[PDB]
Design a protein around this ligand. Structure first.
Ligand SMILES: O=C(O)[C@H]1O[C@@H](O[C@H]2[C@H](O)[C@H](O)[C@H](O[C@H]3[C@H](O)[C@H](O)[C@H](O[C@H]4[C@H](O)[C@H](O)[C@H](O[C@H]5[C@H](O)[C@H](O)[C@H](O)O[C@@H]5C(=O)O)O[C@@H]4C(=O)O)O[C@@H]3C(=O)O)O[C@@H]2C(=O)O)[C@@H](O)[C@@H](O)[C@@H]1O
Lengths: 492, 288, 363, 287, 363
């Protein structure tokens, strides 16, 4: 028996969790075993680990007719609302009230967090993931490649263009080839974010391809006529080889390849995990130094950082109607908002990854001295996964390098950070339009975007046809509906 | 009558025939019963119009026809050609080695073949682009380029299936009695004169049956390859009716329109194989 | 084209197995010569070596002055008729006949006149537009001979052409072949597993066994005077009896055999046989009768009837002398029946004797 | 064919034939040996434009990576299971049915022949077949994969035709001796059918082994998954966890060498069993 | 076991047409009867109907008291020898022989006497342990007959057993069959496409063509007195010469031929010939001779020699009178040349005449 037990009798449940097209839930996970010993609830994962796309597996599991006990994952928020309304997911509201003190207290202390996850009816069908922090992404560049190539770090777009040109043409790594790739990243969508250098928005929030509020009017960054101006130039950057050719396909292994093979000169990504590499591969790559840099002056004469860390996110887990045990499950979810739950969901397993020091969890030397980023280890261990847990920023502060913190403070002090997009509250009638159309819309946008970047089609020639296709796809219906939801809230 | 009379002795034979027939009634004709269903929801006779009016499906059937023509023109004759070339080879050891090497890739899995395609053609990494760099000509990302999709596919195809399909033809030209060749030798017929004047018209019915078998589907050609290696940028030229039916039906979980397209595809395949069989019946020796 | 063909010490080897050994035969122009023997010998291999279908591993063969050894079959000026169906199924009969001339296509009126003459000779005129799909076997062999003669070669080679047909068809085609040679008169080599075709068709018969040529000569030379016990056993409709025998007491006059029987012998000057010598004595079934010679001179052999098979107006009588049995052709009535003793009358002029060790006749 | 040698045009023809066929053969052999070489070689070399035909720094570590994979060997065992039992059930459903369809006297011979043959040129479809699998409850089932397809009309008509190629004198003599139906089939017809049996079990073997799609669709649980599906994840899709990516630098084998080693370990049994199979099916001059 | 078998009005029908029509034959115990005819016919179907391998569509057949019409082949108490030898290549020779016996009982029956007697009769001691893979054809048919006799049935059924063997082997196997039937003596029915085997083996020959039974009777009864022109043309070593003929002035006395030739005829009461009647006149090749040797004698003919084929001590002479040719056996020792006229003497007692229309035997 334990004090953290949500049930006296051992509870084994079937959970289908497929997220980020990489990991599936594992009951043999150290974090999961810890969670089982603490909560007296065992989560058995029914999923295909050999599967690739997560959203596809979600749709398949849903349309299979046979529902598991708990459904977790990422970007399932809208789907959580759809099937929550359709009756596939049980409303947790009163369960949260009576049986989940920590969750209720959190939503009480965070009304703006609770508001976003609410259905048109107001019910909460899922316990979400709430990342803690301020900054999200910032630009990074090689220190040594600026020196031996004899040039000062770029203050603007032109200087950056000349720097990347000097990376591709002149040989910065001294191997004697042109093989080095100026721009890389482990997020393909970042290839669009480059349009910020020309003053174009790639999104409205942390989530890629998201609407934003411009002077009280809801608008999509991609549908705007200032988007293809930047898309042209980044397509030129690909054409010049300034951008990674595999940048769409390479994905997660990017930073561990280009930087490890010393082929990369520039990236975006995030502060901590990127700055971890400096210490990590320092023994392999002799002269490697990666430094944080300001968001260089755009064509608009401004300093733009489009990505900030959003409160909560479209992530989490929900309870199906076939669960038969709503109480133990909602209490199990309540456990992850508790201090020990946060401890095991962030810092991993005590006695292995971290120890308890004066009330605060501190990672072991084994974890901190590892070349591989801590979060990448916790992923494999079952921690920092997009479950209903509350993130603890201290865990990130521990392995954050002083230069990374300096870059963070630089971005905060510089106020390059843009305000995030909170979203709107839609009624049940106007929600269906978004739910049905927006998926196909953003799929189309991403496919055409990838077609533009790689230079398969032409930006200018296919621009009008693209606009008309967006018109017939029903995008502007969702847009005007979003304006219908927005204008009722913010007036003055 | 004689029904019960012969059945009494034929009993065990029908007991052998029973599980197979039942198997076919279950796993084959029952989904045909399901084919007559799903044609209505969600009655009926409607979503076909959605199929014909959609820009996606029309390019799907477009590239289905295109891939059919390409695979038929380039892919089908190659096994025959291989068989003819191997047939002309003396020094039984060398011919044996050739047979081993050429028949080998058939046993390679389709996912492994596709993996070989993506590995060989990977930019800055794959051997192909490296050999292109050694001669010093450009470089190419192949799988992201639609233009290269079809030439790659069939190539891989004629790498994998050429020899194994050449086995049948080789066995067909080895079934010819030597006298036909030797008498022509007495008359002083050329090698090419022999392969053209006798060997080929002797192997004609075999290649005809194998042709109406090839034309038996031809809409489903390279489905498992396409569903594997088709990139979002190459989605345009790579898409085939079978791939459409899969993506909407199995993935997108839309059973109605997918079943409709399935019925359409099966019907057209039946028509084209009926025509093919007829023309390979009247004109060509034997047939179905 | 009438031409001679000389075969000198030819030998064919397959993987050092030596199929045929030192075969030598000379063939005069327009002469009918038949290679005949059991399965396995190199007579078909010899014919094919003349055709050029098989390589010559040694010795030299030539037509007239020119040596065809390194020559191509096209240039060998020969035409071969294969035993199994050498006509192509997709082409018509006329196309099958003209097939050889269509290679260089020649002149159109040349193949037209050629196929005309050929079809007139073999009666392939109505079959001209017919296809090999529906045809008789004999008709296929006939059109085969048509394209054979349409080349107008120096030598006609035949490899067991009638082997795939029925006995009646074999006979009819045999007569037609003889007639055909009576017409054209071209030099022709003929291969047979059958003795009958050899006896009827050949101007000269050459027997071949295990690659070794056993004997040559006219049909009647082989029939009346076989060189050995094998040749003796080969030619004729019934096999020659050939049972062991001895001499002992009297040498040139009498010779005795197994059943305790004793047979007197004609003087036959030039023999000089020796007494006590182990021998194999044989006689033809046509030369033995049942009480045929009335009060015969020397009192011929006695035996015991085994079985009786009527063939017709004639009959085949199996008689047993001691542990050995001899066959005798008899009349169509022949009450007989098995188990009862019987007296056989042997013709003294037709008797044959061969040495027990040396297969040679010596008699 | 025949062996005249002789004529010049024929000589040149044969030579250029051997040359072209040789070139094509080398084109066929090159990828496999490239995969072996690259899988053996180092990640650095492979990444730098080294290797091609021959190995370079011979890392050997990629195999060390694939050997520590649990799901790989699990899926391997799954493919072995599917091949063995799949082939068995296949033969069980085919051979007696083809032997029944072979014999000249049957009531529904015509209509049964039609029932079996019709499936060739007309099929219901992908989706209705999947739904058919759903209603039977064979979804996510090993037996669902086994009995899912034990039969192709091709194998049936082939086995039937070869059964008919056998002289009826054997069956008739058996009937004269008292043997009826089944006891005949086992004792004479089957040992006479050895090559046909070999062909069918071969086609079924490679079908079960190299089959991926329907095995991927009908199955969910990772422990039931076959090799080709896991390969479909790792070899083509090439998506990877941050674990593997972080394990790329601490190892020094590349992803390419890992893939190569994987498909090497995948095709090894094929390369092993191929000579015996082919040499059996030849038994004579080529063919 | 010696037992009679009666076949009464048995008929087999396939779809539109019918292969055999109302065939009725009675077979005495231990009697040898041979069904003989052309390729397509119902003799094999009849034998198969006796075997029970094929259904009886009408009529009744029985062995002794038991009616076998409705029966299992196992219980039919007959043993059949197939043309394809019916022996299994995978099983051993002894296993092939005992194959029928391996179903019931065991070594309790001792099994030894059966296989001993069976192998001893056909005389194969060493072949007891052997596989059909390596054997001669005659040995295969011999072991097949081994499994035939190992059943010890009432009836031995034979379907073209010697058809797959060579003439040399065929004759020997024929003799062995004759000896076998003379030894065991069980009732046996035999099917042949060959006339010779029918003549030799059968106690009674029954000819069948494209239908029911053409004729029955002893071999010499068929040879001497054929019922029609087909039976006449079939039986014999050579085929019977059959040429068209007519009658003009005198009826029973004279008969006329193409070349302006005229033949006197013996009266032979029971003929009833008609003058002016279109006729087909036949004669045996053995019954014709050359010119003035025997006498006037029984008839005379003038002709022109076509071709001459020596077989041996005998010879086959093809002679042409009108547009039709007749064959005559002559000695091999009498020189004959082609193209020159020749005189043939026909034996008047052996001549045959048939109606041109009815085909039935007239004279
Ligand atoms: O990096 C740091 O240092 C800090 O990182 C913190 O964790 C971060 C990670 O670093 C990543 O930023 C992570 O981003 C996730 C993201 O949350 C999603 O889960 C995303 O999922 C994507 C899918 O894998 C897939 O690519 C999908 O494709 C779409 C396509 O774009 C289009 O829409 C089409 O129509 O549909 C397909 C489809 O299949 O859905 O897009 C998904 C998308 O949303 O991008 O994967 C990324 C990822 O990088 O894998 O977020 C976490 C986080 O929790 O914030 C943390 O460790 C901190 O301590 C570190 O310091």
């Amino acid at each position: 028996k334990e004090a953290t037990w949500v049930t006296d009798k051992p509870l084994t449940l079937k959970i289908h969790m497929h997220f980020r097209d990489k990991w599936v839930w594992d009951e043999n996970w150290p974090v999961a075993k810890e969670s089982f010993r603490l909560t007296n609830v065992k989560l058995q994962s029914v999923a295909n680990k050999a599967a690739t796309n997560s959203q596809e597996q979600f749709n398949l599991m849903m349309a299979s007719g046979d529902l598991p006990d708990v459904v977790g994952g990422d970007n399932l928020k809208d789907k959580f609302i759809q099937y929550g309304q359709e009756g596939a997911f049980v409303p947790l509201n009163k369960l949260i009230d009576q049986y989940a003190p920590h969750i209720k207290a959190f939503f009480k202390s965070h009304p703006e967090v609770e508001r976003a996850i609410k259905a048109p009816d107001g019910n909460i069908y899922f316990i979400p993931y709430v990342p803690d922090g301020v900054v999200a992404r910032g630009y990074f560049i090689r220190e040594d490649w600026l020196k031996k190539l004899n040039l000062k770090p770029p203050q603007n777009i032109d200087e950056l263009y000349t720097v990347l040109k000097a990376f591709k043409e002149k040989d910065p790594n001294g191997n004697g080839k042109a093989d080095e790739v100026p721009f890389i990243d482990r997020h393909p969508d970042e290839v669009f974010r480059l349009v910020n250098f020309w003053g174009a928005r790639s999104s409205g929030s942390d989530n890629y391809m998201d609407f934003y509020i411009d002077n009280g009017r809801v608008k999509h960054p991609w549908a705007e006529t200032a988007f293809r101006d930047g898309m042209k130039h980044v397509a030129q950057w690909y054409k010049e080889g300034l951008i990674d050719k595999e940048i769409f396909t390479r994905k997660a292994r990017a930073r561990e390849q280009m930087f490890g093979g010393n082929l990369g000169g520039f990236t975006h990504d995030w502060f901590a995990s990127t700055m971890t590499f400096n210490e990590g591969l320092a023994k392999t790559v002799p002269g490697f130094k990666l430094i944080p840099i300001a968001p260089p002056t755009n064509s608009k004469g401004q300093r733009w950082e489009e990505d900030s860390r959003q409160k909560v996110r479209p992530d989490g887990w929900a309870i199906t109607v076939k669960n038969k045990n709503p109480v133990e499950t909602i209490k199990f979810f309540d456990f992850y908002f508790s201090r020990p739950g946060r401890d095991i969901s962030n810092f991993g397993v005590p006695g292995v990854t971290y120890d308890i020091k004066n009330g605060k969890a501190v990672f072991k030397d084994s974890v901190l001295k590892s070349p591989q980023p801590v979060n990448n280890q916790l992923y494999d261990m079952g921690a920092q996964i997009p479950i209903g847990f509350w993130q603890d920023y201290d865990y990130e502060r521990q392995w954050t390098t002083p230069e990374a913190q300096a870059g963070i403070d630089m971005y905060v002090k510089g106020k390059y950070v843009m305000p995030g997009f909170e979203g709107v509250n839609m009624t049940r009638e106007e929600r269906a339009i978004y739910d049905k159309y927006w998926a196909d819309v953003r799929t189309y946008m991403y496919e055409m975007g990838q077609a533009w970047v790689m230079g398969t089609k032409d930006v200018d020639k296919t621009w009008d046809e693209y606009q008309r296709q967006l018109k017939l796809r029903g995008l502007y219906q969702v847009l005007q509906m979003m304006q219908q939801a927005y204008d009722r809230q913010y007036k003055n | 009558e004689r029904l019960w009379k012969d059945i009494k002795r034929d009993w065990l034979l029908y007991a052998m025939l029973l599980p197979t027939i039942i198997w076919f009634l279950i796993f084959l004709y029952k989904p045909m019963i399901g084919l007559q269903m799903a044609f209505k929801q969600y009655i009926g006779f409607d979503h076909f119009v959605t199929l014909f009016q959609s820009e996606q499906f029309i390019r799907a059937i477009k590239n289905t026809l295109t891939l059919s023509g390409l695979s038929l023109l380039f892919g089908f004759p190659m096994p025959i050609l291989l068989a003819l070339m191997i047939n002309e080879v003396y020094s039984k050891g060398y011919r044996k080695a050739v047979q081993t090497i050429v028949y080998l890739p058939h046993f390679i899995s389709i996912v492994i073949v596709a993996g070989l395609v993506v590995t060989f053609l990977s930019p800055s990494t794959g051997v192909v682009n490296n050999m292109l760099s050694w001669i010093g000509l450009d470089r190419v990302y192949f799988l992201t380029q639609p233009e290269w999709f079809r030439p790659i596919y069939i190539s891989s195809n004629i790498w994998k299936e050429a020899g194994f399909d050449s086995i049948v033809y080789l066995a067909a030209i080895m079934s010819i009695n030597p006298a036909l060749y030797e008498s022509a030798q007495v008359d002083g017929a050329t090698r090419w004169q022999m392969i053209t004047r006798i060997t080929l018209p002797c192997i004609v019915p075999t290649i005809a049956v194998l042709l109406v078998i090839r034309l038996g589907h031809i809409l489903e050609v390279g489905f498992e390859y396409i569903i594997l290696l088709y990139q979002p940028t190459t989605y345009e030229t790579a898409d085939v009716i079978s791939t459409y039916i899969y993506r909407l039906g199995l993935q997108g979980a839309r059973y109605d329109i997918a079943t409709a397209a399935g019925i359409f595809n099966a019907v057209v395949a039946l028509v084209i194989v009926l025509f093919a069989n007829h023309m390979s019946r009247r004109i060509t020796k034997t047939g179905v | 084209m009438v031409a001679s063909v000389s075969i000198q010490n030819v030998v064919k080897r397959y993987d050092k197995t030596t199929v045929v050994h030192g075969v030598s035969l000379d063939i005069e122009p327009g002469e009918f010569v038949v290679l005949v023997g059991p399965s396995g010998c190199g007579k078909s291999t010899t014919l094919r070596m003349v055709a050029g279908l098989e390589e010559i591993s040694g010795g030299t063969i030539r037509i007239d002055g020119r040596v065809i050894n390194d020559l191509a079959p096209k240039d060998r000026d020969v035409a071969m008729v294969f035993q199994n169906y050498a006509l192509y199924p997709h082409l018509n009969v006329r196309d099958n006949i003209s097939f050889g001339l269509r290679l260089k296509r020649t002149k159109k009126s040349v193949i037209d006149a050629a196929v005309k003459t050929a079809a007139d000779i073999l009666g392939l005129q109505p079959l001209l537009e017919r296809k090999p799909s529906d045809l008789s076997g004999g008709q296929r062999q006939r059109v085969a001979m048509g394209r054979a003669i349409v080349r107008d070669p120096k030598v006609f080679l035949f490899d067991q052409p009638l082997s795939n047909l029925d006995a009646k068809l074999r006979t009819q085609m045999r007569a037609e072949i003889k007639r055909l040679h009576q017409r054209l008169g071209t030099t022709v080599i003929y291969v047979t597993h059958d003795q009958v075709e050899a006896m009827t068709l050949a101007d000269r018969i050459v027997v071949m066994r295990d690659g070794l040529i056993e004997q040559i000569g006219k049909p009647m030379d082989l029939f009346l005077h076989p060189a050995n016990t094998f040749v003796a056993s080969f030619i004729g409709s019934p096999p020659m009896n050939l049972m062991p025998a001895r001499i002992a007491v009297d040498s040139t006059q009498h010779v005795e055999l197994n059943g305790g029987n004793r047979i007197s012998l004609l003087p036959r000057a030039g023999t000089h046989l020796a007494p006590g010598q182990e021998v194999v004595f044989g006689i033809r079934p046509e030369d033995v009768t049942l009480d045929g010679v009335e009060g015969s001179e020397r009192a011929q052999i006695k035996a015991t009837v085994d079985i009786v098979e009527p063939l017709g107006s004639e009959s085949i009588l199996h008689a047993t002398v001691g542990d050995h049995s001899l066959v005798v052709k008899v009349g169509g009535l022949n009450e007989v029946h098995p188990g009862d003793p019987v007296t056989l009358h042997v013709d003294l002029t037709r008797v044959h004797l061969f040495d027990a060790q040396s297969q040679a006749s010596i008699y | 064919l025949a062996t005249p040698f002789y004529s010049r045009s024929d000589r040149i023809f044969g030579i250029v034939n051997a040359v072209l066929l040789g070139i094509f053969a080398l084109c066929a052999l090159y990828p496999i040996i490239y995969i072996f070489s690259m899988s053996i070689s180092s990640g650095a070399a492979v990444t730098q434009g080294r290797v091609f035909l021959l190995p370079v720094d011979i890392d050997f570590s990629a195999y060390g990576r694939v050997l520590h994979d649990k799901l790989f060997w699990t899926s391997y065992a799954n493919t072995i299971f599917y091949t063995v039992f799949g082939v068995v059930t296949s033969l069980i459903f085919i051979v007696p049915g083809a032997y029944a369809l072979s014999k000249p006297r049957i009531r529904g011979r015509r209509v049964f022949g039609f029932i079996i043959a019709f499936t060739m040129w007309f099929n219901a479809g992908m989706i209705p077949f999947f739904l058919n699998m759903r209603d039977l409850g064979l979804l996510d089932n090993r037996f669902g994969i086994l009995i899912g397809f034990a039969c192709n009309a091709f194998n049936i008509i082939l086995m039937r035709n070869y059964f008919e190629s056998i002289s009826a004198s054997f069956e008739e003599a058996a009937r004269m001796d008292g043997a009826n139906d089944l006891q005949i089939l086992w004792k004479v017809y089957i040992p006479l059918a050895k090559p046909a049996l070999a062909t069918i079990t071969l086609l079924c073997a490679i079908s079960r082994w190299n089959g991926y799609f329907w095995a991927m669709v009908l199955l969910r649980a990772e422990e039931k998954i076959p090799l080709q599906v896991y390969l479909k994840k790792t070899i083509v899709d090439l998506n990877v966890n941050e674990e593997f990516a972080g394990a790329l630098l601490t190892n020094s084998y590349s992803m390419e060498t890992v893939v190569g080693a994987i498909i090497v370990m995948s095709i090894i049994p094929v390369i092993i069993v191929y000579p015996v199979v082919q040499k059996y099916f030849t038994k004579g001059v080529m063919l």
